[PDB]
Structures are given as C-alpha cells and as structure tokens.
Design a protein around this ligand. Structure first.
Ligand SMILES: Cc1cc2nc3c(=O)[nH]c(=O)nc-3n(C[C@H](O)[C@H](O)[C@H](O)COP(=O)(O)OP(=O)(O)OC[C@H]3O[C@@H](n4cnc5c(N)ncnc54)[C@H](O)[C@@H]3O)c2cc1C
Ligand SMILES: Cc1cc2nc3c(=O)[nH]c(=O)nc-3n(C[C@H](O)[C@H](O)[C@H](O)COP(=O)(O)OP(=O)(O)OC[C@H]3O[C@@H](n4cnc5c(N)ncnc54)[C@H](O)[C@@H]3O)c2cc1C
Ligand SMILES: C[C@]12CCC(=O)C=C1CC[C@@H]1[C@@H]2CC[C@]2(C)C(=O)CC[C@@H]12
Ligand SMILES: C[C@]12CCC(=O)C=C1CC[C@@H]1[C@@H]2CC[C@]2(C)C(=O)CC[C@@H]12
Ligand SMILES: [Cl-]
Ligand SMILES: [Cl-]
Lengths: 483, 483
C-alpha cells in the first residue's frame, strides 16, 4: 500500500494523460470530461466490465434548483432551497462549501446528463415507496415533504430517475440507464479501458506528485503512467471488515452495499500519502419493509413508543431505527389499513412483510408482543386522541396519513430490518483534488464517488451517491486533464 | 505537517534515546518505563509546566479484575468479567485485543501505580454522583451496576481515585495526585524535560523511520533527535474546529475538553506518514445536572417519553440524550423527591439545577411544558402503575430508586445540557506502536493517550482515559526504549 517510487519502475505497461481507476459513475463522468478537454484517457477496471454498483442501483440522481424535469412536473425549487434542505438533512457537520457548489451547479448538471443521452420521463410519482414502480422520472427521495424538513425548506422532489423499463435493483437497475449513455459518450470520445485491472498502489516521484499506479492484471504486476493525473473512482469501503469495525461499526453484520470490490483500497492508497478523511462513520441505512404499509400504521420502538413520522423517507426511518432505537421496531397497523397498504402500488411488493401478531384489542397485542402493561396501550390511546382530529403533534406525520388505529390490530416484527453502506472517505475539494492533512492538494491525485466524502456527512437521501459521484466525477476529469 | 527529511537537518538542538511529546499522563508513564529500561529520555512540553488535562481531571482510573482496592472494599471482579463489561459498554466495534490486554494487565497496573507513589484510600463511595465527595478510592464509574450492563456482566466498581483533599475538577482535580507521584518518579530516574516546546512535524530518514521531531521553542525552530523512538502523547483533537466538523460533528458548539493544546497536531503529523485512525466519531458526553436529583425522578425526551434508566452512569445519560434524543431532556420529579435529592451528598452541588416549571398535577405540568395532551400524562401513568410494585419493566432502573411520582410535580429543563471531548485517534498496537494503513508499525513511532484510539470505541466510562493513557503510556515507553 506504501507508494512506489517512480525511479524504481523499470517499464510502463500502459501510459495515458488521465488514468481513471474504476469504471462506475464517478469514473465514467471523469473520463468524459477529461476526453472532452483533449486528454488521452485510460480507465482501469477491476472486473471484466463497466458499471460497478452504479449499474445495479435504483437510478435516483439527487438534483434540483429548478431542473426542466421539476418544472415540467410543476415543482418550484432553487439552489438556495435545495442547499437549506441538504444542510439540515445530510449532516450534522455537512460540508457547506461542497453542498453549496453542488446546488448551484445542479440544473447545469441535469442538462449535462441529458446532453450525454440520459433519458428522463417528465412525470412524477407521488406515492410512498423506495422507487417509482413505473418509468417516471421524478420522486421525493429524501424526506423533503415530511417532518422535520418540510418546515425548514420548501418541499421539492429531487429524485431524478432515468427512463427505463423492467428495472431490477441489484441486477440491472435504473442506474444502468445512467451508465449506458455515459459509456457510449466516453467511447465515442476515444476513452480507452483495460479490464481485470486491480489497482494496488500509487506511484510518486521525488516531489511527492502522483505520476501513475501499480496494478495486478491477468495475473501479473503492471505499471500504468499518468502524465497529468490519477482519478480514484473505485468505490467505498463497505466490504472491508477491518475498516467497518474501525470506522463504521454500526454496519457490523448488516452489509447492504452492492458489490464486493468496494474494499476501501483507494482510500488506503491515498492515506499512505497523507490524504485526509472525513465522516468515516457516515452510513446509508435501508429498512426492508414496504413504505405503503409503513405509512398506514405507527412505528414503535422496543418500549412501545413512537419515534419517527411514518411518512418520511424510509432511509431516514432506517437510520432512526438503527442509530437511535437499538435496531428495534414494530409496525402497529389495523387490519383494514394493512389490507389497503398491501394492495397499494409499489416497486417492492417483495417487501410486504406479513404481521407476526394479530389481536382483537391493543391490550392483547401488547401482551402478545411481550411489552409491559400500558406501554403500547398508552401510545395508541394518545395517538388516537389526536388522530381523531387529523393531528400528529408528537411527530408531525402529515394529516393525510393520520387517523385513529382501529381493530382488529396487527404488529409486524421489524427488529433487525436494517442494512447499509458507507458514505465516508477521502476529503476532496470542489474540484475533486484529494486533500493532504496539510490542507493542500496532493499533486496529480483526484477522486470522486464513494471513495470520497461527498455531499452526505451523516443523513442520507436517495440519489446523492449517483448525484455527487457524477457531479464530482466531472470535476475530477476536468482537474486531472489540466496541464 | 509533511515529514522533514533527516538529511535536511543541519544541526540537532537536542538529542535523546526516547523523545516524548507531551507531559500529561501518557507522556509521564512512557518516560518512567523508558528511563527504567536505561534509555536517555527527553519530554517536550508545549506549555510552561507538566500536567496537561490530566492534572485537571477528577482522577478516575478505570481498573479492575481484582485489585487490592476492590478486595479491601469487598467487590469481586476478574479480567474476564471486566472484559465482558467493557466490550458491551464501550463499543460498538470495540478493539477486543486491546480491551483483553488492558483487562489482563489491570491488577499489575494498579500495583505499578501504587509502587510509583499514587495513594488510594481503601474505601468505597456508593451514592450516585460524578465523583467521590470525599477522599474515597473506589466508585462505580461506567454504569456497571445499572441496566443493561448489570445483566451482561457482574457489577463491579472500577473507578479507582487517588487520595486527595480539596479536589477541584478543572483547576487541580484528583488527577493531580495521579500526575505528581509519577512526575516525582520520572525526575528521580533522570527524565529530562524541555518546556515551551510546540512539536510541529516528524523527521524521517530515507527508510521512513521516525528519527526525531521539529518544534517551535522560545520563538525559534528547533530539531530534536530521537535515537530509539518518538512517543506522541500530546492529547486529543477536541479544540481543532476543522477536525471536529469532519470527524465528530456532534460536538460542534459543545466543547467539554479541559485544555486548548488539544489541537490534533500529533494525529495529523502521524497521518502525514500514512498512519491509520480509528473511531474518530467517538465522544465522551457529560450531562451537567447532579446525579442525586436525576436518580430520584424520570428523564423524558422532547416527546415526553422515558429513554434511559435514571440510575445509570450520568455520562451514559449524556450520550443517550445527545446522540438519540436530539439533545432534548427534562427531569420530571415530585417536590419531596427534589428536596431529598437536593439535600443528598454530592461532589457537584453547583449542578443542582432548579426546576423551571412546577404544578399541582401532571396534566398542568404537561401543558406548561408545551407537550401535547397525554404525552407526559401517559408516561407518568404507566411508570406509576409499575412503580407502585417497585418495578421499572421499560428501562430497568433498580428497584431501590423506583416509586411512583407524586404531587406537586416539577420539571427541570435539561435541553442543551451536554458537552464532550473526543476519544478517536491514531490506531496503535498493544505495544503502542503507531500503525500504518498497511497494518505494519511505522518504525520509530509510538503513541498513547488521547492522540490514540484507546479502550473506548463509542461508549465511555469515567477513568478509561487516565487508565488507558497510563497503561499504554507504559507500553509506549517500553517499546520506544528497545534497541
Ligand atoms: C440496492 C442499492 C440501490 C442503490 N441505488 C442507488 C440510487 O438509486 N441512487 C444513488 O445515489 N445511490 C444508490 N445506491 C448506491 C450507489 O449504487 C453507489 O453508492 C454508487 O454506485 C457508487 O459509485 P462509485 O462510482 O463510487 O462506485 P461504482 O459504481 O461501484 O464503481 C467503482 C468501480 O471501481 C471498480 N474497482 C474497485 N476496486 C478497484 C480496484 N482496486 N482497481 C480498479 N477498479 C476497482 C469496481 O469494480 C467498480 O466497477 C444504491 C445502493 C444499493 C445497495
Ligand atoms: C472535566 C473533566 C474531567 C475529567 N476527568 C477524568 C477522569 O477523572 N478520568 C479519566 O479517565 N478522564 C478524565 N477526563 C479526561 C482526561 O482528563 C483526558 O482525556 C486525559 O488527561 C488526556 O491524557 P493525555 O496524556 O492524552 O493528554 P494530557 O494530559 O492533556 O497531556 C498532553 C500534553 O501534551 C501537551 N501538548 C499538546 N500539544 C503539544 C505539542 N504540539 N507539542 C508538545 N506538547 C503538546 C499538552 O500541553 C499537555 O501537557 C476528564 C476530562 C474533563 C474535561
Ligand atoms: C434506499 C436504496 C439505496 C440507496 C439509494 O440511493 C436508493 C435506494 C432505492 C432502492 C432501495 C435501496 C436500499 C435497499 C432497498 C430498500 C431494497 O431492498 C429494495 C429497494 C431498495
Ligand atoms: C464525566 C467527567 C469527565 C470524564 C471522566 O472520566 C470523569 C468525569 C468526572 C467529573 C465530571 C466530568 C465531566 C464534566 C462534569 C460533569 C462537571 O461539569 C462536574 C463534574 C464533571
Ligand atoms: Cl453500493
Ligand atoms: Cl480533556
């Protein structure tokens, strides 16, 4: 992992101006910009093909500030409104400079993606869910239209989803229709790619400038020269057990990341040179129950208490559950509401969890669940008193979802229903320069995507990873191509 | 911050075998062992005198496994029992190797401190509080005798406190009577000290070995040669704003650390060489209300719900409040119980917070506090139903503290009552070698105390910082002195 001295490299197996490690969203975006800038670009990919986790993703791209898609669907937004939301939802300690920059450039970036051939359907999906069930292009994806954020920023949907039929998250998701047009764009520009390239270490000259990389390819060690810059775009550390334990131990035993090639190698390679890190504890957290069920009941913790409005982003529900409720949750829902939720339109019918317990009364359900006498009964009594007035003054679930819980009543066992992926990584500038602990860029070294700390510092919103990976991938390619 | 090449050092202003940066607990312990090993030892201290945060501390040292003090006070314990507690309380993702090692060596370490002249009174203080009000030597300090840990490990008090009169935490606390005998020990061994030494950067030779340091002293740059090793013992990053935002943003605006010299410089200096980090998000969190009041009421969050047993360690109350309850807490307590708690013996009478609201009924108190109708009333009704049977089945507060809340009833406003310090830092071996991201020690480089990730990975117990700082300080001095 220690840097290799350039003087010890006897021959270069490959050479380029800009060397991109990793052919996912950050890598392809970097390659497009570097090639447009006139640089000779070589992408090094560890597997046999392009796509990475990106090609398996739902396809959300977190964009706003007044995109043509938002306007076509009739949703106002501005860079200031977007920034206000993101600072509140994606912290604490979110990078204000980076978020401001991301927001100010968001409409341009949407247009840039469209220009590269990424298609979006100008239609909005408005029901609770993890993704649009159909080929709709816009959806709320961060809890913008739920408490607490709906009183902090004006709600605006920012989940932009490329148009694709038969989307299968985990196999060939909506993320594929982000990747494919970008790859086509890069290929037409003359971007070169080498596969089975497992990048291992950076090569530095005697000034400390990164001037290439060492990799294993087809069973042998190879050296690849980078005349202008190396872009690290190899993904996260989610599958590195040592790093999960040291940095993000809330994910021990509950991995959710898409691919095992996310082993943190590029983070470590850069740290070897003195590169800085940020928010290494930050984790996306999913909650594997269908949102159409969740929104029609109340979530209670292990003490039978409500703790989150049931109409917020289900990722936020995941974080609140894992982080603050010791991963213990139950959905309390009346039979009629369960039936309605189970019939509602969803992209994830396989997440329609069946109730574990069902009873004629809350008193019986409470005993059945092993909760102390009164713990659940009182929660439901207070909820129902206010819900009869369409009010949730405790958690501010929107009135449209608020009504008394009736009988018979059921409980879903949602203990241990979370899993997630890492959001922390290398510290980078808005120009995607990797920062040394000195606060200065490491010459020749750039990075984007989930090997970096991006817009998310703590909270997560769907689309922020493909969003910041593509946005800062562009910036890395521009910076790397400079002479 | 980048390392200085040894070839560029024209003259060494000072030279020693073992150079210790920082004259606090970790530094003095390292110096004693290095000097006993026969090494020429030089301590470099940034301020005009020794002590650091240690001399201002309460003086808890987290020790167990059957110390002579525990035995004299009639408390059984073992290294296995201590380890079981620490793994559960100080994680998630606590370093099992390090904790095991710390526990197996704990009795020897207590004896080692006694040999150096640290005095302990063989008496136990058994009442809730932040420290012993008198000169007692043993106290519960980690929640060992409260839920959930009292069902996971057999309760044993491990807060060992040096004997001292007129202890004043923040000025000259019990920690002074840990420091003073150790300093005397080091001086008699011939340990040398230089003051106004602000260490800035490490010096490395062409193999990457750390062979000295560069500092500013009395207005000028000086170089100090370390023939055998440099021990980093300069404290935490609590007062580095950039680092707090990047790594531990839950502490933004709520610093609790003792001294401003905790600016993370030694962490950064080591990272420049490729040193690894762990648990950079981990933070001790205090809660500035007297425990004798807390234990006699119920704590409720901003939704009027109980969330922590009121007889656990008040540091754990602090963490639960800040981390999981959005820093919002109120103490609900009847007038008679408040009077009893306010008269109870405490080291911190200045933390006897007065009630903000008081009412004849819970219904009125609830409205007064701006809580929704029923939110607090129901909490108290359920608590009281079980408390009339001496039972807290929701949070398992010990029965001795459980009884119904009566009337008149008061509420203390404990919103924004937390502050804390950082626990994350350099990754080190059990021999206090600083680890590179490669997993190999950086030659010549050792570290201990709050510039390192020690026994605590998340949870905190009082005494663990002086405990692991002195324990691993010893190990650093032993390792550094080796030829
Ligand atoms: C189920 C699921 C759904 C998701 N859907 C979304 C979504 O809709 N919107 C969103 O924003 N996020 C989503 N994500 C997250 C998103 O998929 C990833 O965070 C994002 O794709 C990472 O982008 P990247 O460019 O950093 O990595 P990748 O797209 O994974 O690309 C990294 C490339 O680097 C290669 N590589 C790894 N190591 C090396 C090496 N040593 N040498 C050379 N190459 C190497 C990998 O093989 C890979 O091809 C989802 C995650 C999951 C788990
Ligand atoms: C109110 C309060 C009470 C506490 N009480 C306890 C307790 O009872 N038990 C417990 O375990 N913990 C306690 N702590 C925490 C404990 O005080 C510290 O975590 C511990 O003293 C740190 O030990 P150290 O050796 O790393 O740092 P220190 O004891 O602070 O020593 C570090 C030394 O390094 C010097 N230094 C800094 N920078 C440089 C530099 N660049 N060059 C040269 N020297 C430098 C500093 O001046 C200092 O003298 C308490 C904290 C607070 C806030
Ligand atoms: C939250 C999420 C990841 C991060 C992101 O940005 C986009 C999505 C949408 C699809 C989610 C997924 C997490 C895992 C989910 C819950 C499933 O098991 C089926 C649907 C899927
Ligand atoms: C928790 C603590 C720090 C970490 C540690 O290990 C030992 C102590 C004991 C004294 C506490 C202090 C934190 C701040 C407290 C609450 C005060 O404001 C007065 C008493 C004091
Ligand atoms: Cl992923
Ligand atoms: Cl401190």
């Amino acid at each position: 992992i220690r840097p290799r001295s350039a003087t010890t490299v006897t021959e270069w197996d490959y050479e380029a101006d800009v060397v991109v490690a990793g052919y996912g969203i950050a890598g392809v975006a970097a390659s497009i910009e570097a090639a447009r800038a006139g640089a000779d670009v070589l992408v090094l990919e560890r597997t046999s093909g392009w796509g990475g986790a990106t090609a398996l993703a739902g396809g959300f791209i977190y964009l706003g500030g007044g995109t043509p898609l938002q306007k076509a669907c009739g949703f106002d937004d501005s860079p200031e409104n977007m920034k206000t939301f993101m600072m509140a939802a994606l912290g604490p300690g979110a990078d204000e400079e980076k978020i401001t920059d991301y927001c100010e450039g968001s409409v341009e970036h949407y247009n840039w993606l469209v220009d590269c051939g990424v298609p979006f359907k100008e239609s909005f999906w408005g029901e609770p869910g993890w993704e649009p069930p159909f080929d709709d292009g816009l959806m709320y994806s961060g809890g913008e239209n739920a408490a607490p954020f709906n009183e902090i920023a004006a709600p605006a949907p920012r989940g932009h989803v490329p148009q694709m039929d038969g989307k299968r998250t985990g196999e060939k998701g909506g993320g594929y229709m982000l990747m494919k047009p970008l790859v086509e764009t890069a290929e037409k520009l003359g971007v070169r790619a080498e596969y089975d390239m497992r990048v291992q270490t950076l090569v530095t000259d005697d000034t400390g400038r990164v001037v290439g990389i060492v990799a294993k390819q087809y069973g042998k060690e190879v050296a690849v020269r980078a005349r202008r810059g190396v872009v690290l775009a190899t993904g996260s550390f989610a599958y590195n057990d040592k790093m999960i334990e040291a940095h993000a131990p809330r994910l021990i035993g509950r991995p959710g990341a898409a691919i095992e090639e996310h082993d943190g190698r590029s983070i470590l390679m850069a740290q070897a040179l003195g590169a800085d890190l940020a928010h290494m504890d930050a984790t996306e957290v999913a909650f594997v129950c269908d949102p159409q069920l969740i929104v029609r009941g109340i979530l209670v913790n292990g003490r039978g208490q409500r703790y989150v409005p049931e109409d917020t982003y289900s990722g936020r529900i995941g974080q609140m559950t894992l982080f603050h409720q010791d991963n213990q949750a139950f959905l309390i829902i009346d039979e009629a509401s369960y039936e309605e939720g189970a019939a509602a339109t969803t992209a994830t019918p396989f997440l329609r969890v069946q109730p574990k317990w069902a009873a004629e009364t809350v008193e019986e359900l409470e005993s059945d669940m092993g909760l102390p006498a009164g713990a659940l009964q009182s929660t439901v009594e207070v909820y129902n008193k206010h819900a009869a007035e369409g009010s949730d003054p405790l958690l501010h679930k929107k009135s449209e979802w608020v009504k008394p819980i009736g009988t018979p009543v059921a409980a879903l066992d949602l203990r241990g229903f979370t899993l997630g992926f890492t959001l922390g990584g290398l510290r980078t500038t808005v120009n995607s320069e990797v920062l040394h602990v000195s606060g200065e860029p490491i010459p020749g070294l750039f990075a984007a995507g989930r090997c970096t700390s991006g817009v998310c510092a703590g909270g997560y919103a769907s689309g922020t990873s493909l969003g910041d990976g593509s946005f800062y991938g562009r910036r890395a390619g521009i910076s790397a191509a400079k002479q």
